[PDB]
């Protein structure tokens, strides 16, 4: 056949199978980097998270303890 078996030895590889595998492995990493560069928010956060303790009583309308 086009590929003969070997005994106790590394098998015979075609150029086509090696090249195609490298192309799709590269395409995976190009894709992730391209998306990460353009959509980094989707993995790190889209909006700031406010600190509730930083809000003043005037914003929250907490009346002074005297009243």
């Amino acid at each position: 056949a086009h590929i003969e078996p070997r005994y106790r030895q590394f098998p015979q590889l075609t150029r086509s199978q090696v090249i195609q595998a490298e192309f799709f492995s590269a395409t995976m990493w190009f894709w992730i980097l391209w998306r990460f560069w353009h959509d980094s928010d989707a993995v790190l956060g889209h909006f700031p998270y406010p600190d509730p303790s930083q809000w003043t009583d005037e914003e929250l309308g907490i009346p002074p303890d005297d009243e």
Binding site: H2, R8, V43, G45
Partner: protein
């Protein structure tokens, strides 16, 4: 899930076929270079399964986790779900480490061959799907909810970090198999291997009781 899970099964079929119907990972190894295209699909499928950013599995799984920890939920179910997400990286590491890495452990008559176009094309189509199908779909489906996007930084990245930690820990565990040490199994190890004894107990006890009652009491 349909894309990369079907691909993973097809990649394992490629390995099983080349190793004369061998399915035990302990008897594989060294296939990373011997089977280059099956290896690329297996790595892409594994990364898609573990929610690697922007692969098909990230667009569903990642949203689910962030909705899970920002919801009014059982605290135990949330904690169980996160730990299982880490376990996903661990067993994904196992398949890659044992099937593809290290030295070959299969028989001597090497017949590895992944060069059939039917095999290459069928996996090739699912490989493209496992890279872009998630992105394509999320950008085309109409919105039918209110996605939760405001949350603490640590709730946003919980899915990613527990996955990374699982990868790191899984790698350390895999490396210890190489050391020249022998350890007796733990009760935990046996429990995991024997599937919590559920098949062992229940598939002997239920059949026995029902079948014995059928003959002894119902009939005789």
């Amino acid at each position: 899930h349909a894309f990369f899970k079907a691909m993973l099964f097809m990649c394992s079929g490629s390995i099983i076929h080349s190793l004369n119907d061998e399915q035990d990972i302990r008897k594989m190894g060294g296939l990373f270079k011997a089977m280059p295209f099956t290896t690329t699909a297996l790595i892409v499928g594994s990364l898609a399964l573990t929610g690697m950013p922007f692969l098909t599995g990230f667009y569903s799984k990642d949203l689910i986790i962030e909705a899970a920890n920002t919801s009014y939920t059982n605290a135990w179910a949330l904690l169980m779900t996160l730990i299982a997400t880490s376990f996903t990286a661990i067993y994904s590491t196992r398949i890659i480490f044992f099937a593809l890495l290290g030295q070959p452990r299969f028989p001597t008559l090497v017949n590895i061959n992944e060069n059939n176009p039917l095999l290459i094309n069928s996996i090739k189509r699912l490989l493209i799907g496992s890279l872009f199908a998630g992105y394509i779909i999320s950008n085309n489906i109409p919105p039918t909810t209110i996605p939760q996007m405001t949350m603490p930084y640590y709730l946003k990245t919980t899915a990613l970090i527990v996955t990374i930690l699982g990868f790191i820990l899984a790698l350390e565990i895999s490396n210890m198999t190489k050391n020249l040490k022998y350890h007796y199994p733990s009760n935990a190890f046996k429990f995991s291997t024997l599937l919590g004894y559920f098949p062992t107990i229940m598939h002997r006890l239920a059949p026995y009781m029902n079948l014995s009652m059928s003959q002894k009491s119902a009939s005789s």
